[PDB]
Amino acid sequence: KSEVAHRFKDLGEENFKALVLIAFAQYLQQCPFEDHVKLVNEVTEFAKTCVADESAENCDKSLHTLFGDKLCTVAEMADCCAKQEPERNECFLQHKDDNPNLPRLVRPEVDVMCTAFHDNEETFLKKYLYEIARRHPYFYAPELLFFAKRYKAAFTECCQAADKAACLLPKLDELRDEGKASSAKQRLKCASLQKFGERAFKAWAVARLSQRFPKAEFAEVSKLVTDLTKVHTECCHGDLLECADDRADLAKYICENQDSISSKLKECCEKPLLEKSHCIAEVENDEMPADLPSLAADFVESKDVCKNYAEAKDVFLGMFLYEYARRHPDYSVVLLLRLAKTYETTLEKCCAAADPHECYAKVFDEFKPLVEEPQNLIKQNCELFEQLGEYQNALLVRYTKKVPQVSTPTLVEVSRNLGKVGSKCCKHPEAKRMPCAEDYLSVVLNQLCVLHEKTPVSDRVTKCCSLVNRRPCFSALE
Amino acid sequence: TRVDQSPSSLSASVGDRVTITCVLTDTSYPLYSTYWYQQKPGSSNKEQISISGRYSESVNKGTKSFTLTISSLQPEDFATYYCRAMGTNIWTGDGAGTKVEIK
């Protein structure tokens, strides 16, 4: 009936207001805080009427019409406001860009912050949301609400501490780092969903969730993947209220179905809404079932291999991804995707022959050189920095020698991050190195692909921007 | 895309024959497979059921519709049943459920 009324009552006023502020800040990144506050309040006001009387005028309008109409009021160029829904929202999405950069934020001194945090906490936390949102327009909105809660907690403790800055600053820098990374992953997800569609995102998610929930049935994992995809499609299309509502529903579903999913969720599911979701998304892999058969039975020897591949390519390749990933939590997701790609390419060729099995019988031998390529390239650079030290320089020389068409101070910023990769990931054992290393690395490269797209200067880097082979692309270039 | 499950609730005696229908709706991708789950009175969890014995399933790919029939109800049958559908594109979703209750 009333969409605003529905979400308002689902989300609650405090989260409703916060999510709306984020929506507005991510679209109109250059508007001053005080403007957004007004629009938010107006919108929230309107929503409160609809809650009391769902029949009230304008209460049956779509969220994009309502909010798009509010945004287009305020006296960065936009011919978007000349357009009607659904075109309008699409135009707003296109003009959203993480490239348009504002000056860095200069924090007041700790005493002044803590003081402001005490005199008006609501505005203080609002300003936080506004500032992150406008600087990171692709930030996963329901996750930003949790950052805010962590931000609020950091000020709740540290403001009474002996050395406020000694307590607070490391917490605020950590939060900043996690926010930068979180923002980077999400931007990658949005790029893929926006350009390609769901397929690439769903392959990644089948891989990822099968490592995390090894004991879940394929249909269960698949149901979770579908839900997650819906959550992220809405977020990437600026349906933040729907996004947050569905994420909460997904957390509730997972907690009610722990027995079909994972034994490691008990604790997560006792926590409060915002951190329950964060917890589930960060939960560690469950242990795989004990006596799983080899993959050869279902994927090589089975007489129905080609039949399964022909009748439902995505399902079959999804089952391959699932069965493989659940056995290999030590692999990176991109490796698992390259193997699935290899397997698919082999079937596309052989399932045409008179005797297909003859053709693809040794398909798993193709996987050997693939699994080793990242296992070494890591071992080598991990040992090379086990005798070199963090203080980064060697990487600067190589990568710049590869592509010197990019800005100089930007190239140094990338090298610093690269040094942070081997800084922590080499500390963990071998069966946990690839996951954190090769995946994060592929994210750092997206930060590189997007920044360069704004000011084009090279033709070699832009060619890289397949999400799976993005590493072998830049890693091989001489 | 979503799965419409009907009826939402049912009353029957022991020995009755009962049918549940699910339709995969609002999608352009064909129905590939189906699954059924039982949530016992208590409801903390669902368990997948096997289509054998007194349990039957009919699938019509043309209407993306499918049906579960329980032929001779026994006391352990009274529970909540959920259907799940998977499209050939791996879209997977669940019906809202059927409460099967004794008269």
Swiss-Prot record, chain A:
Entry-annotated residues carrying Phosphothreonine: T408, T410
Binding positions for Zn(2+) per the UniProt entry: H64, H237, D239
GO BP annotations listed: cellular response to calcium ion starvation; cellular response to starvation; negative regulation of mitochondrial depolarization
Subcellular localization(s) per the UniProt record: Secreted
Function according to Swiss-Prot or TrEMBL: Binds water, Ca(2+), Na(+), K(+), fatty acids, hormones, bilirubin and drugs. Its main function is the regulation of the colloidal osmotic pressure of blood. Major zinc transporter in plasma, typically binds about 80% of all plasma zinc. Major calcium and magnesium transporter in plasma, binds approximately 45% of circulating calcium and magnesium in plasma. Potentially has more than two calcium-binding sites and might additionally bind calcium in a non-specific manner.
UniProt record similarity statement: Belongs to the ALB/AFP/VDB family.
Entry protein name: Albumin
Highest classification ranks of the organism: Eukaryota, Metazoa, Chordata, Craniata, Vertebrata
Span of the entire protein shown here: 28 to 516 of 609
